[PDB]
Amino acid sequence: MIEDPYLGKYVTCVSARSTDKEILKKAQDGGIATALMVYALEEGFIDGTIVAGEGDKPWQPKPVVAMTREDILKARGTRYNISPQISWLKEATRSFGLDKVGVTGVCCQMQAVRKAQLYPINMRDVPGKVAFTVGLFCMENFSYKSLQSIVEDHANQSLGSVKKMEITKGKFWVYTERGNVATVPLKATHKYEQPGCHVCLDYVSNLADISTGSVGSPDGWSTVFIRTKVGNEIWSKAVADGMFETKPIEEVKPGLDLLRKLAKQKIDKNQKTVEERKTFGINKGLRNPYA
Template sequence: MQKNNISTITRNALCTACGACAGICPSDAIKMITNTAGYLVASVNGDLCNNCGKCLEICPSNPENLPSIETGDPFHGVCIAGYVGYARDNTLRQISQSGGIVTALLCYLLDQNKIDGAIVNNFSQEERRPQAVFVSTKPELIEACGSYYAQSSVVKTILENSDKRLAAVVLGCQAESLKLIREKYPKINLPKLTIGLICAGQYSRKMIDDLIEKSSCNHERILKFRFRDKAVGWPGDVHIVSSEKDCWISKQNRLRLKPVYELHRCIACYDQMNIFCDIVCGDPWGISNKQQPEGHTVVIARTEAGKKLLENAIRDGAIVLEELSTKDIFTGQTVDGRHKTKFYTSRDIFQENNWLFPFPKDWFDNITYTPANRRTHHELDKRLEYSRDLYLTRDREDYFRKTNLKKKQLMGNLIKNLFNRVLYYTKTKK
């Protein structure tokens, strides 16, 4: 008999590595491992699994899960208020992502003794990977500043620290898992407040290796890794600090690698805007006069608790915010155009290929969106096929063959596009 556990999710390339399953398993049958392609995945020990099904009950990729939602629009979620702003502490603003609001709020909660600590990501020097950790001091929070686009098991770390008063920085899938846990296991102590990040997806942890190899720090001990360091101005370049020197890689190199390492399930995700958190923060894309080098953060309060925290932090001088229409935030993040089209097209492609789709179908009925044209459908079909195939690859040599071929294709497309631009420019000048 097939066991009622999370393995059905990993077999379908849908694990986001939130770690909720590993954290809630009563028999310690689930471990988070790195697969051949560098993705962090849940692995079930069949000898220990007692078929209780708890892991599937709280998995954000199980289409049978229906966390309660207070709005008919899962792309926008509940929006109480919108803002744009930055951390009052200029040093904190400069070393943090965007305008530093997330770190400033966590530091404020510590100063006010509202929490014992926070669950955040920092960089493991030993593994050269991001890791979800509990931190309880401002220096630890500051050390963890920045973006980590590779996976880490945030919910597992939250559950391991459920005896504490926590705040947590989460992605949409992680926030949904916490929502499911809260509804199905209300006695578990979960974070008092969640700060969500606007999310464009996670990537294989081998993307970090690739970027380090492109630098002159490759053969040294890596002390720090930042996907986006704002020292060169927002949005930031890749910054790698080794035992010997600092190395910088332009953001264009990072962007070119995204199609090579993107996570299959993330491409099809609806929750870019993190609807299950208390506060969501992100970059000020499309917001006029708020894209200066020093950085700003757009913010949406989704709960009264989140709104109250923002108001108190403003009053006490921890952050600077001005009101901003949430409509402008969603427009800047291209939610109602590009994002919805990508989601609904992905859903069609999953159905065409008879792949397990990770979300309840009835959530997304009667929502207006722009259907994809033939070219967009074809390109997304290829993205999903490649990312799924890469995720499920078991042979190491086959993995390198696939990623190297993908890089060659991307480089060929880049050269072709550059040639066409030069040709167009030359014709227009004549």
């Protein structure tokens, strides 16, 4: 068990991509989040999972309890605006009748699940029915109006034409279905970020069973942390079953060196913000949820 001060607690870290070519056709990166949930369903580690499905406006996610391989695949690809994944957490155990709930989401959503497991506050039956969590890396998120403003104004693209969006190499990238590419400098996006992201002290989904993301791995690949006993059992079985190609992370460039550095910048910048809240006023401060 490595206990990293910026990458959290984990057993191993590899670079990986799914061997399911259908999944990879529309996965954001390696298809880890989709492949892990499909496999968990077909093997019976879960009987349903919360995923960011398609919503009612283009590129606006809608949380949904998926119970088939087909419904899980609809959630492929990154939506860079808020998806309130945890709103279906209790309901998954009520009208859906699930015994083994999967949850996907970003770092704060992993935190929400773990708080619910230890301090269930009107969350009956949830502690014991959470079966598997896959956490995405997340530097920051946006309101939907923020995302519209970035894509339509700054990138000058129509949302109905966008095939993929990607934050990497210092730019917000927009790919269209007809084959065009537009970029926006990340400096331009800063005003649009969701303010509650600025106290977040968690980059690589420290509290998930398995965490997955893009940084540290070449395109089409994911950096994966296997963290908990649940996470290790499922990953071992999946690898043994042929579900994934892997490479130890230290044989991969830029790997864990860059990743640990981006995690450190996030925590340091946001810890400072948390500190300034304390003296925000005159002889008064703002609340610290971590106090």
